[PDB]
């Protein structure tokens, strides 16, 4: 079954580690669809940034793709 919908007010009520977990559980599968091997690394990189921006990325496929693309470029240069 699908994970539940995440809103700003819901996210805001949770402890800091829990907010990152809420965001990560939703980001990971979408990122993994794009980059099966780097998914874990990409997701951890993205979780470094602000939760309200991460929530926006979850609400806008275009926004998530753009961020993923930058993270991959960075990882590929390092590897």
């Amino acid at each position: 079954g699908p994970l539940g919908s995440l809103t700003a007010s819901m996210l805001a009520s949770a402890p800091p580690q829990e907010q990152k977990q809420m965001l990560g559980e939703r980001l990971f599968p979408l990122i993994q669809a794009m980059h099966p091997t780097l998914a874990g690394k990409i997701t951890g990189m993205l979780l470094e940034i602000d939760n309200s921006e991460l929530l926006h990325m979850l609400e806008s496929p275009e926004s998530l793709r753009s961020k993923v693309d930058e993270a991959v470029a960075v990882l590929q240069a390092h590897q």
Binding site: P16, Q17, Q21, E25, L27, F28, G44, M45, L47
Partner: peptide, 15 residues
């Protein structure tokens, strides 16, 4: 450089 995220495992990047 940040810890990888693994579904269903507590992320160690902030805890």
């Amino acid at each position: 450089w940040p810890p990888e995220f693994h579904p269903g495992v507590p992320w160690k990047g902030l805890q």
